Amino acid sequence: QRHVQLNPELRFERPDKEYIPLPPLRDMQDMVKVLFLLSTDKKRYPDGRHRTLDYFRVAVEMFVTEVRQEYKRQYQQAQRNGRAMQRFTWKNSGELAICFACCCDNVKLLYDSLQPGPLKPLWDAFVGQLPPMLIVQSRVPETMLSSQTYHTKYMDWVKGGTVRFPSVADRRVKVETYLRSGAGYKIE
Amino acid sequence: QRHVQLNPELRFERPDKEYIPLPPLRDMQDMVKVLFLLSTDKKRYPDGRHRTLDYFRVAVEMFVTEVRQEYKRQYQQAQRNGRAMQRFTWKNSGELAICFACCCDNVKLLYDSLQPGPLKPLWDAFVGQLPPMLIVQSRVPETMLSSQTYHTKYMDWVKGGTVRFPSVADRRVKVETYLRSGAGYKI
Ligand SMILES: [Cl-]
Numbered sequence: 001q002r003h004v005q006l007n008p009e010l011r012f013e014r015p016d017k018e019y020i021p022l023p024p025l026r027d028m029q030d031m032v033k034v035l036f037l038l039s040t041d042k043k044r045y046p047d048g049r050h051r052t053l054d055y056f057r058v059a060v061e062m063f064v065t066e067v068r069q070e071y072k073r074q075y076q077q078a079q080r081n082g083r084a085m086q087r088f089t090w091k092n093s094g095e096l097a098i099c100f101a102c103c104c105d106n107v108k109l110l111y112d113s114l115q116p117g118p119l120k121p122l123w124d125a126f127v128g129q130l131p132p133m134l135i136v137q138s139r140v141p142e143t144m145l146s147s148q149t150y151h152t153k154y155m156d157w158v159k160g161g162t163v164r165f166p167s168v169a170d171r172r173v174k175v176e177t178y179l180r181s182g183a184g185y186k187i188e
Numbered sequence: 189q190r191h192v193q194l195n196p197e198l199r200f201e202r203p204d205k206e207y208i209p210l211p212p213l214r215d216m217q218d219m220v221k222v223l224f225l226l227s228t229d230k231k232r233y234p235d236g237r238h239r240t241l242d243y244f245r246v247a248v249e250m251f252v253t254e255v256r257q258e259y260k261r262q263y264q265q266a267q268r269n270g271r272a273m274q275r276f277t278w279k280n281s282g283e284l285a286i287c288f289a290c291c292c293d294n295v296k297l298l299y300d301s302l303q304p305g306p307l308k309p310l311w312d313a314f315v316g317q318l319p320p321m322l323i324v325q326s327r328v329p330e331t332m333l334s335s336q337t338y339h340t341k342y343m344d345w346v347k348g349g350t351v352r353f354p355s356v357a358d359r360r361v362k363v364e365t366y367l368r369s370g371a372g373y374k375i
Contacts, residue, residue, distance in 0.1 A: 019324065112329035116320035117220065118313075122336055162274045 002137075004057045005047035008180045013049045020050050020110075025119040034121055035129035038110065052106070052113040055172075058179045059102035060137065065184070066099045067138045067145070088145040090153060093163050095186040097153070102171045103130065104157045127154065192245045193235035196371040198364060200239045207303040208238050222309050223317035224324075226298065240294070240301040246363045247290035252325045254284045259328045276333035278341065281353060285341070290359045291318065292345045315342070 014020075023037040023044065024030050038045055038053060039060065045053055071088060078085035090096060104127075111126050121129075131150035135142060166174065178184055211225045211232060212218070226233060227245060235242055259276060266273035279285060299314050309317075319338035323330060354362065368375055 017327075108331055112331050116323040116330065116335065118316040118320065118335075120320075120330075120335065123331055123334060161272050 001042075002061075004054060004061055004179065006179065006182050007048055007054065010051070010176065010180060011048070012051045012054070013046075016051050018050075019115040020045070020053060020113050021115050022117060022120060025117065031119060031121050031125070032129065034114075035107070035110075035126060036133055038114075039133055050113065052109045054179060055175050056103070056106035056110045058175050059099065059106045060134065062175070062178055062184055063096070063099035063103050063134060064137045066096050066186070067134070067140055070096055071138075071140045071144070085144070088140060088149075090145070090149060092153075092156065093165060098166055098171065098174070100153055101157050101160075101166075102175055103134070104154060105168055105171055106175065130154075189230075192242060192249055192367065194367065194369070194371045195236055195242065196368045196373065196375045198239070198368060199236070200242070201237045204239050206238075208233075208241060208298075208301045209303050210305075210307055213307045219309055219313070220317065223295075223314060224321050226302075227321060238301065240297050242367060243360070243363050244291070244294035244298045246367050247287065247294045248322065248325065250363070250366055251284070251287035251291050251322060254287050255322070255326045255328055255333070258284055259326075259332065273332065276328065276337075278333070278337060280341075280344070286354055286359065286362065288341055289345055289348075289353075290363055291322070292342060293356055293359055294363070318342075 020038070023034055023041070025034070039057060047054060047057070074089060075085050107127060107130050111123055114120060131147045131154075134150065135145070135147065138145075161168075174185075208226070211222060211229065213222070226241060227248060233241060235245070262277060263273050295315060295318050299311060302308050319335050319342075322338065323333075323335070326333075349356070
């Protein structure tokens, strides 16, 4: 469904070393939908089959939860003060940023786990599919939070790799904890 | 197995002039695996049957060995210097490049040795299978070493054969020497 099936023992049907087979790849429309299909087609790609995919799905779920909560908070704050919310404010050091970094970390791992082939999208094209998927799942209007803003935040993540922001390992524990227990923690 | 059977005497069961039969091909999914099947199915295509196929297998083995070793070295070098390795560095003049050129030389020879007919893949499709096979066998992440880089290096090889680097003949001897070497005597 929308939510990832919990996996307390972190057990997967296929080994971590195995490549994930690609969805149908014949044409350009197939190519742009690869990430969306990996993410959402639980008939072809059930929860619990591939560790890399489940981790990515969890990161997405956590991000979507946070962006929706933050959007609602900002919208209500604007309303209480008699003003129209003009744009979503994306802070670079909080829970949203952390969740987005999880998405980026795991979309990279997912990309590397996908079966190579002549029609496998290039990395830039593949990671370019991430904002549209987050937009649709979040239901946050693009007039409030644009693909261009996502691009900026992606660039920030690229730069941070090459404050007391969680490391890659910290972020993986965050994802694993959620997958095991359904438990998320935002520092307050 | 994973490794090519050593062949100190360079003896092959079939003559070099003989065409290699294609694997059974029902569909387009079969078609995109043709190179991988030729390369890895040693039940249908045992080592020591076709010189052309064995030479290609050796080229692949040498390349895969080198790319994995070079990746590991670069990854460790990055770690020691407190940085996340961002991209694989592909040197154009060393063992890696030489082995890649061997792969290209021999994938061409292999293609030309495949039994002609309507089922034989087109060249563009066939050579297109080479980078994915090298990626899968190496297990080097594509975020580090992309298909696009392979494409660029392939083009470099095409351009070089339309300096300072082993010739086609030298690269063939390289392959032959590897295939012969490690059986316990030098021949
Ligand atoms: Cl390049």
